[PDB]
Design a protein around this ligand. Structure first.
Ligand SMILES: CSC[C@H]1O[C@@H](n2cnc3c(N)ncnc32)[C@H](O)[C@@H]1O
Lengths: 310, 625
């Protein structure tokens, strides 16, 4: 095991993000037992994960990791149980991981984080019901929005627009944000109120298209333009925790649920692949940049699974 | 001074966290008993077979710490009222699990949110836990003054905040509380943790909470301002509310992160202690009345019963009250004897119910003050108190005072009286039967004789107090009617309550009573205009008496005799609380009823809804003749 790297990883795997070069970012929390904390791990050999002694780099966080995002190639931005957003910096040699900043702005657990298209700004969401806009360079809150009336489940920055991001809350609202507007939020979704929205993913190519998942296992395709719900499929028997698009020219949609299953869907939202591999909740998915047929899932069963997608 | 706790939703190590919050000066910690993000599956394989442990060990603290220093919190993913069946089922199971663990741990309290309107299934599950073994632990329902939907920034272009004001709408969080506690049948274990926001609502919205069982106030760091030296502080309005809450002796809870970074959370806490020690100090009455707040006591019946030595002692411990008596007699003597007849004229002064003699002494001080001449009879049916009197007259009064061991209704007086003096008044004035007693004695008063007191009047006012409704209700006893508790008055230092309308006179008596035919029976109809939404639980009673001319005693708040702690108010409960809407009138009816044997009160509310007549034929409560 490397220096500054913990000789043991917490059981609950929260996040998995393949960088450009195919290196693996792992977030984990301790959700039970004496010590409720979290860890950040780097696996330049992804097939070695989750074993700690084969890791490139690892560090201990004060608290659990609710959410994670790569900031460029050396940056890790952390949503903490502590109500802190944490910026973690990679080593020159990438042997260790060191705290750039840890800011206690959220009055409750930080649930969700997304980096805006600049790489100089990020959006956080919390159980404190607020959404905050972060200046990563100056390590400060530019804006705090109480648009929602219950805990914020997800925030996803637009691929190419630094002022645009989606949010969803247990208040049953999906908000489309544009900080350039004086009233920056706009309530979007299906014409009919339905089940609580749980997960968000923009289309990587079509900047006005996104999918959301719900508490009832339904995945839905939305056009900002049509302001009407395009297509919906009942993919899961439990809430949709995550929605991830393939790096392919015509993307694939990876669906992850508390039903402990992975589903891979076409553009028409039809079902291509399904994995009962995990025997607890499936928390994240990343497609290899190297081989786009490879999909890596992590779960609370502490399984790092590598899928071969047709 | 102030009892406060820390609210946290992140506890990496319970030992370290607890030490921290103690170091900062917190009496207790509100924390999760399971990891807030650790959602559990109970029905579906494979997640249901998730290997444990399901949380951290009870061995990590002493039983004493668990019992005194910890308040548990329901996990936030638990939604028993979810419209998704599976989430409902899982939340039912997790809620029981977390509550059962709290009971396992011996936690003194457990926090549950009212964060929306429909908490029906949440209530059903809590009621089930409560009805699973008799336990003492409290449930703190975390309710905001202002619902989060009505707090949100107006930053949604196509969903503007309704800026148009709604009276009842702004009271929606009270209705959340009311429905929850009504479903749970006013369990004494279920109380309010009132969460305060940066934007305090209208006064009516705050007044909604007046008589409610508030155990805690939650103060987010967010609502605190910054002074010149950058210290956390509060708006004067926030401060007026804190001063209000200190009177209810609630526990304060600080929630959220330290927004005053170049300081520590002792800053927030020190501000509270600062306010507490800097609170407007309480009057001597409030110091007298310090232990008795909302304490239910039986009205004394000094006719039917022989009061104890220490009862007379407390009666005597009101120097203001006897100064008034001295002054009334002082004035009456000068009125009755001109200075020309000063030495030739000796007035026959009779004290009727003289107890241990304080009115005898006041009568004597009055006569020397007036420099006029008096002959004193001290009439007292309580032979134990006659012991005190006869020792006083042998040792001190001498033959000026004739002690009479007799009922004033039976006594054959050797002569007629110039002045009769009496302290036969309870908290509803005539509730100890001053009228019947004085009526019996009035044959031996001179045709021009004065009774001190000459007059007394009872007053009533409708009140709201879910606290006192519950305390009455808790007074069920074996071997009697299960609702008799509600058909009797209590003497009580009314504290946690809302007076719904100005007091109105109920019953009036005059002495002597020159009526050719005298009937002490009464029937009275009162209309209390109500300007708030509320729930009626009963009627506060008070009284005023005219000792002589302008000399009075009153426990009626508007005219309260200053510094006179001798009588707390009386309370007439009703069996079923009655909802009253702003604008509506409360119509109550009171009867004073009698036999040769007993006198009693009956009462009914007739508007906005009818109650049952309470205490028909004195079946639950009588006053012995
Ligand atoms: C000093 S409190 C009033 C006193 O009046 C006495 N008392 C009440 N009713 C009567 C009565 N009918 N005759 C004589 N004393 C009375 C009581 O025993 C009590 O000490």
């Amino acid at each position: 095991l490397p220096p500054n790297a913990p000789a043991c990883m917490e059981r609950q795997l929260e996040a998995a993000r393949y960088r450009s070069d195919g290196a693996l970012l792992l977030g984990a929390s301790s959700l039970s037992g004496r010590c409720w904390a979290g860890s950040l791990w780097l696996f330049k050999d992804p097939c070695a994960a989750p074993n700690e002694g084969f890791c490139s780099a690892g560090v201990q966080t004060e608290a659990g990791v609710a959410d994670l995002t790569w900031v460029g190639e050396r940056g890790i931005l952390v949503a903490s149980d502590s109500g802190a957003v944490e910026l973690w910096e990679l080593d020159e040699n990438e042997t260790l991981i060191v705290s750039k900043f840890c800011k206690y702005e959220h009055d409750d657990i930080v649930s969700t984080v997304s980096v805006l298209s600049s790489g100089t700004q990020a959006v956080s969401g919390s159980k404190d019901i607020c959404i905050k806009v972060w200046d990563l360079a100056q390590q400060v809150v530019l804006s705090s929005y109480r648009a929602h009336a219950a805990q914020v489940t997800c925030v996803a920055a637009s691929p190419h627009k630094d002022s645009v991001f989606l949010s969803c809350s247990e208040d049953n609202r999906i908000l489309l944000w544009d900080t350039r507007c004086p009233k920056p939020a706009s309530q979007i979704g299906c014409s009919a109120p339905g089940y609580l929205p749980t997960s968000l993913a923009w289309h990587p190519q079509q900047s006005e298209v996104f999918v959301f998942g719900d508490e009832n296992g339904t995945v839905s395709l939305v056009d900002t333009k049509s302001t009407s719900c395009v297509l919906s499929s009942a993919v899961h028997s439990q809430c949709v925790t995550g929605l991830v698009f393939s790096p392919h020219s015509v993307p694939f949609l990876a669906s992850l649920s508390e039903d402990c299953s992975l589903a891979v869907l076409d553009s028409s939202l039809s079902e291509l692949f399904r994995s009962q591999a995990h025997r607890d909740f499936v928390r994240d998915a990343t497609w290899s940049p190297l081989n786009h047929s490879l999909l890596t899932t992590v779960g609370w069963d502490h399984q790092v699974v590598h899928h071969v997608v047709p | 001074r102030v009892s406060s706790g820390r609210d946290l939703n992140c506890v990496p190590e319970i030992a370290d966290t607890l030490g921290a919050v103690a170091k900062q000066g917190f009496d207790f910690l509100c924390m999760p008993v399971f990891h807030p993000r650790f959602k559990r599956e109970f029905i579906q394989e494979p997640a249901k077979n998730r290997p444990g442990p399901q949380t951290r060990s009870d061995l990590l603290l002493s039983g004493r710490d668990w019992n005194t220093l910890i308040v548990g919190k329901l996990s936030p993913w638990i939604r028993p009222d979810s419209k998704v069946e599976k989430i409902r089922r899982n939340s039912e199971a997790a809620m029981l699990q977390e509550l059962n663990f709290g009971a396992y741990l011996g936690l003194p309290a457990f926090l549950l949110p009212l964060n929306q309107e429909d908490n029906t299934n949440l209530a059903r599950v809590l009621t089930n836990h409560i009805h699973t073994g008799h336990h003492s632990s409290m449930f703190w329902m975390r309710v905001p003054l202002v619902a989060p939907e009505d707090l949100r920034d107006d930053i949604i272009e196509n969903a503007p905040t309704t800026h148009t004001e709604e009276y009842s709408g702004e009271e929606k969080t009270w209705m959340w509380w009311h429905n929850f506690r009504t479903l749970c049948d006013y369990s004494k274990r279920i109380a309010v943790a009132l969460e305060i926001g940066a934007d305090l609502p209208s006064n009516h919205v705050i007044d909604r909470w007046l008589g409610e069982p508030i155990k805690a106030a939650i103060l987010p760091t967010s609502i605190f301002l910054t002074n010149k030296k950058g210290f956390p502080v509060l708006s004067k309005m926030h401060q007026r509310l804190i001063f209000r809450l200190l009177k209810l002796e609630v526990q304060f809870i600080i929630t959220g992160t330290n927004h005053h970074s170049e300081k520590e959370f002792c800053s927030y806490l020190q501000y509270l202690e600062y306010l507490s020690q800097n609170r407007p100090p309480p009057n001597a009455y409030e110091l007298f009345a310090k232990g008795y707040e909302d304490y239910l006591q039986s009205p004394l019946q000094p006719l039917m019963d022989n009061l104890e030595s220490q009862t007379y002692e407390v009666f005597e411990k009101d120097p203001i009250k006897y100064s008034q008596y001295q002054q009334a007699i002082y004035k009456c003597l000068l009125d009755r004897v001109p200075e020309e007849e000063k030495d030739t004229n000796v007035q026959v002064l009779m004290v009727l119910g003289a107890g241990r003699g304080p009115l005898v002494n006041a009568s004597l001080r009055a006569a020397k003050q007036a420099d006029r001449r008096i002959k004193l009879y001290a009439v007292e049916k309580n032979p134990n108190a006659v012991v005190t009197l006869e020792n006083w007259q042998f040792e001190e009064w001498g033959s000026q005072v004739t002690v009479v061991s007799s009922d004033m209704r039976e006594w054959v007086a050797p002569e007629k009286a110039d002045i009769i003096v009496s302290e036969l008044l309870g908290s509803f004035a005539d509730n100890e039967l001053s009228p019947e007693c004085l009526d019996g004695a009035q044959h031996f008063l001179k045709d021009d004789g004065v009774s001190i007191p000459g007059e007394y009047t009872s007053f009533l006012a409708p009140i709201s107090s879910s606290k006192l409704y519950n305390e009455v209700r808790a007074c069920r006893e074996k071997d009697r009617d299960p609702e008799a508790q509600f058909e009797m008055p209590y003497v009580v230092r009314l504290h946690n309550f809302h007076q719904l309308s100005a007091p109105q006179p109920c019953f009036t008596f005059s002495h002597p009573n020159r009526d050719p035919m005298i009937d002490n029976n009464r029937y009275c109809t009162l209309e209390f205009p109500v300007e708030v939404n509320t729930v009626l639980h009963g009627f506060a009673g008070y009284f005023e008496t005219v000792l002589y001319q302008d000399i009075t005693l009153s426990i009626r708040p508007e005219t309260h005799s200053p510094g006179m702690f001798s009588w707390f108010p009386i309370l007439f409960p009703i069996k079923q609380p009655i909802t009253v809407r702003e604008g509506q009138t409360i119509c109550v009816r009171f009867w004073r009823c009698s036999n040769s044997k007993k006198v009693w009160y009956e009462w009914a509310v007739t508007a906005p809804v009818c109650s049952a007549i309470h205490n028909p034929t004195g079946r639950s409560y009588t006053i012995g003749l």
